[PDB]
């Protein structure tokens, strides 16, 4: 690995610099290197890993959506033939997106999840597994689409089961998981009613637990609750 000769602590420090610089591909490469040292990640380090890859895949998802839209219009009646280039370039971006998702899934499988025993780490990694299978599902069109969807579902469900047993309903990881699983239901699984029910239940259970929280925790939780509400508004 290109990062094999760099100290763990140096990789972490450079990931933080890359974040400040908005160099997210570098940030991801540093954090991959840090994971590949083989030690478990701290809470802060897990967050750095997530931020890095979320930003990398987010640029790719935004690009893919623009290209897919252009390709779809090219396939309408009365659209002039322009050759293979739009499909080719959409495919290029898609393949790179798939490669990033595969990289993340590979880190989780080798060996982040298997060593994650505390709820906070295990749920966070299983949520990430669901997320990156969801990003794969957003572009999937072939024979394995059902299996990709199934993999996302399974990871999210495992995470949900742990989070309900082990975390308060206000925990930001639990909230963000439920938020993303609701988006999966709505956008991927053709289950808008399930999406809406999960968002409602999650929001209400969190509301009932806010009284237990410090001011700072309250802010963290209410931030994610607001996203649940925003989606409910969009969906109902």
């Amino acid at each position: 690995g290109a990062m094999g000769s760099m100290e763990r602590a140096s990789l972490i420090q450079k990931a933080k610099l890359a974040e400040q610089a908005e160099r997210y591909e570098d940030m991801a490469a540093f954090m991959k290197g840090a994971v590949e040292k083989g030690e478990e990640l701290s809470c802060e380090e897990r967050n750095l890993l997530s931020v890095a890859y979320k930003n990398v895949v987010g640029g790719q998802r935004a690009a893919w959506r623009v290209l897919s839209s252009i390709e779809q219009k090219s396939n309408e009646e009365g659209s002039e033939e322009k050759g293979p280039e739009v499909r080719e370039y959409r495919e290029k971006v898609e393949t790179e997106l798939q490669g990033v998702c595969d990289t993340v899934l590979g880190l989780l499988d080798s060996h982040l999840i298997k060593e994650a025993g505390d709820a906070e780490s295990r749920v966070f990694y299983l949520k990430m597994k669901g997320d990156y299978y969801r990003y794969l599902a957003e572009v999937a069109t072939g024979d394995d689409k059902k299996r990709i969807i199934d993999s996302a579902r399974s990871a999210y469900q495992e995470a949900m089961d742990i989070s309900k047993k082990e975390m308060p309903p206000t925990n930001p990881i639990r909230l963000g998981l439920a938020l993303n699983f609701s988006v999966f239901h709505y956008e991927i699984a053709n289950s808008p009613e399930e999406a809406i029910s999960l968002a409602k239940t999650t929001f209400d259970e969190a509301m009932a637990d806010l009284h237990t929280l410090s001011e700072d925790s309250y802010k963290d939780s209410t931030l994610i609750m607001q996203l649940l509400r925003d989606n409910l508004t969009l969906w109902t």
């Binding site: 967050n47 997320d131 909230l175 938020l179 963290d220 994610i224």
Partner: peptide, 10 residues
């Protein structure tokens, strides 16, 4: 179109 979670959670 929907909002998904921020990357950083604690």
């Amino acid at each position: 179109r929907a909002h998904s979670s921020p990357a950083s959670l604690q």
